[PDB]
Design a protein around this ligand. Structure first.
Ligand code: VO4
Length: 574
């Protein structure tokens, strides 16, 4: 089978000499490959779940062999419930091999063609080529693993046993099913986006050349409400979005959000677009909208965390240092589990409210002086394809990017506080990173002029190459903020999808109306001054709740961290 030529990753080759980072890398490679071939575990929420499961398995295998002192394994060897019972080592003491067995078994269980009968519905739409391409990745990873892989060792066998428990417990086979779901048209309501109202896909994935059939995608409408949570200790809720329920009277906020959406998120050439060239770059930088050779946001978030992990490591040797191994195993488990639960709660709230995307909101507004029936957004980029930009197939409120980012970066901030600097947990840190390149703007990936060719390196395919932009950031607080506002620049999210407008924008004397500069561009608050303090009401619940994705992710990370990475009590699972 012709292996797909993958473009080079911008990262020091030394990172992969550490076996914890190496297995994270294999996970990221499978993420970008399934999104290129249309294999299993695609989309933002399930792709995050895959990495959370990989890192829990790695975490409990490693720490069972090299017992920690500050915390314990996620699961326990002494639990009464067989489902949450961790296997015992019994003499196995090679952590490298135990981690290899756990990582390999988990990734194989997740990406293998379902031989266990359960294929219909759950994955009855994935070609054999997809499975074969992912298999090649798994096969060569065995040969590239630092220190090699000994499948015959007891430690390796133990790790496999560890992955089995986690796989049985947390795998959600029908997680992304949409069967039975249909939008309900109306003001503020999500429906198929007007530039991609229907797509034509093969009737048989094994014959991608016709016949095709009409398909309308609704991404994981039942997941958030039915799936098992990983480590959260309660259910998380957001305030009703402007225009709906208890906040249906918040019309000045809504109308101004419509204004900001047009100015900041329109197509490049529209006379109404006020976004600057730099802001367009900040918008594309954080995309990772499930594109060919790129994958989803959790992939990028891990790429950033690898850099942070290595930049702030306690010891200089990446290959043979149990201190570095332990630090990385713990960090990635915390970050990826937080990313998984953020995906769950952002999806639960997305489909609870079914709030429409800005493209439809602006076009269908209905008022002659507020909407633009012909507006076009910069959009989510269809990188490495000759397709046009699109609107992700799921509700707007809250933003998945914003929630993932709040969780991932608040976790990094809780983990490194007192080690890299000192700050109050709800205030800006000093976790700086440099030489950070996004694959959306690396001087290699591009917008093609003809269909993508999976047998040729991307460099040999005609298109407009994305400018290479090397960035430096001063804090994880900045990372969290830019990640969220990037979606406003693409025009795929409303301001309140990221956070309360009051917390991120500059106020004017007019309530709910914010500042714009000379060229009518929105002015944001300096990162150092931002505090996510504005909360709102819910019609069905008493109390004040966070507004938008960032504050939601932040609360998810704090809860998990504060409870020391402990399973969600079986009592409160759906
Ligand atoms: O991923 V959004 O939900 O920020 O499109």
């Amino acid at each position: 089978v012709t292996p797909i030529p993958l473009p080079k990753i911008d990262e020091p080759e030394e990172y992969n000499t550490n076996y914890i980072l190496f297995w994270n890398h294999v996970g990221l490679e499978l993420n970008r490959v399934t999104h290129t071939v249309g294999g299993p575990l695609t989309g933002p929420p399930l792709s995050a779940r895959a990495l959370g499961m990989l890192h829990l398995a790695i975490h409990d295998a490693y720490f069972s062999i090299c017992p920690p002192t500050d915390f314990t394994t996620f699961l326990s060897p002494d639990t009464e419930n067989a489902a949450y019972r961790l296997p015992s080592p019994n003499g196995a003491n090679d952590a490298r091999q135990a981690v290899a067995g756990a990582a390999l078994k988990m990734l194989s269980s997740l990406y293998m063609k379902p031989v266990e009968q359960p294929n219909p519905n759950p994955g009855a739409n994935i070609s054999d080529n997809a499975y074969a391409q992912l298999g090649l990745v798994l096969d060569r990873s065995v040969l590239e693993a630092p220190g090699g892989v000994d499948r015959e060792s007891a430690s390796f066998m133990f790790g496999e046993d560890v992955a089995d428990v986690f796989f049985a417990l947390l795998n959600d086979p029908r997680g992304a099913s949409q069967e039975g779901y249909h939008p309900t048209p109306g003001r503020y309501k999500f429906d198929d986006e007007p530039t991609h109202p229907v797509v034509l896909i093969p009737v048989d994935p094994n014959n991608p050349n016709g016949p095709k059939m009409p398909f309308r995608q609704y991404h994981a409408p039942f997941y958030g409400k039915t799936t098992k949570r990983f480590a959260t200790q309660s259910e998380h809720f957001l305030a009703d979005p402007p225009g709906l329920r208890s906040n249906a009277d918040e019309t000045a906020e809504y109308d101004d959000a419509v204004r900001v959406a047009i100015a900041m998120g329109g197509a490049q050439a529209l006379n109404s677009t006020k976004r600057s060239p730099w802001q367009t770059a900040q918008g594309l930088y954080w995309a990772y909208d499930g594109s060919n050779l790129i994958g989803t946001p959790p992939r990028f978030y891990n790429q950033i965390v690898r850099r942070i992990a290595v930049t702030y490591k306690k010891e200089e040797d990446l290959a043979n240092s149990e201190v570095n191994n332990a630090d990385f195993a713990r960090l990635f488990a915390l970050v990826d589990v937080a990313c998984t639960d953020a995906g769950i709660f952002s999806w639960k709230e997305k489909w609870e409210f079914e709030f429409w995307r800005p493209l439809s909101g602006v076009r269908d507004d209905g008022r002659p002086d507020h909407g633009d029936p012909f507006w076009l957004t910069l959009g989510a980029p269809a990188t490495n394809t000759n397709d046009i930009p699109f609107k992700p197939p799921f509700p707007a409120y809250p933003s998945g990017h914003a929630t993932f980012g709040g969780a991932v970066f608040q976790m990094v901030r809780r983990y490194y506080n007192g080690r890299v600097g000192t700050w109050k947990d709800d205030e800006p840190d000093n976790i700086a990173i440099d030489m950070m390149i996004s694959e959306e703007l690396n001087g290699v990936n591009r917008d093609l002029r003809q269909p993508y060719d999976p047998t040729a390196p991307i460099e040999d395919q005609p298109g407009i190459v994305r400018t290479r932009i090397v960035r430096h950031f001063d804090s994880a607080w900045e990372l969290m903020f830019e990640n969220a506002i990037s979606r406003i620049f693409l025009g795929v999210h409303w301001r309140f999808d990221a956070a309360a407008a009051r917390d991120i924008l500059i106020p004017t004397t007019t309530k709910d109306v914010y500042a714009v500069d000379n060229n009518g561009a929105t002015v944001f608050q300096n990162v150092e001054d931002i505090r996510y303090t504005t909360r709102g009401t819910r019609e069905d619940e008493e109390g004040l709740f966070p507004i938008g994705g960032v504050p939601l992710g932040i609360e998810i990370a704090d809860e998990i961290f504060n409870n020391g990475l402990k399973p969600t009590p079986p009592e409160i699972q759906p």
